[PDB]
Amino acid sequence: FPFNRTKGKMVRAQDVALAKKWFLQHPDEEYPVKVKVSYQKLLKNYVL
């Protein structure tokens, strides 16, 4: 959605949430348990 349009309206510069997309997607693989648990916090705060 951010992109394909080419016609649309502004957003208050703090509404674009740049980093939401990363913690939606899977954790990937490598990361040590610190960052995975960081993900779970970001979900829990989102869903809520």
Partner 1 sequence: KKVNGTSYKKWSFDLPEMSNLYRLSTPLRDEVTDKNYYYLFDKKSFFNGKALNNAIPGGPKFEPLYPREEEEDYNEFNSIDRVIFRVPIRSEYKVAFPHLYNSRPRSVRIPWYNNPVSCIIQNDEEYDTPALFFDPSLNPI
Residues 8-47 binding RNA (CB under 7 A) are 9, 11-12, 14-15, 17, 20, 26-29, 33, 36-37, 40, 44-46
Task: Determine, following the binding rule CB under 7 A, whether residue 7 of this chain makes contact with RNA.
Answer: no
CA-nearest of 21, 19, 26 to 1 is 21
Give the integer Cα–Cα distance in Å for 35 and 40.
9
| Residue 6 near which of partner 1, RNA, none (CB within 5-8 Å, type-dependent) | partner 1
Task: Determine, following the binding rule CB under 8 A, whether residue 24 of this chain makes contact with partner 1.
Answer: yes
In Å, how far from its chain's centre is CA 45?
A: 11
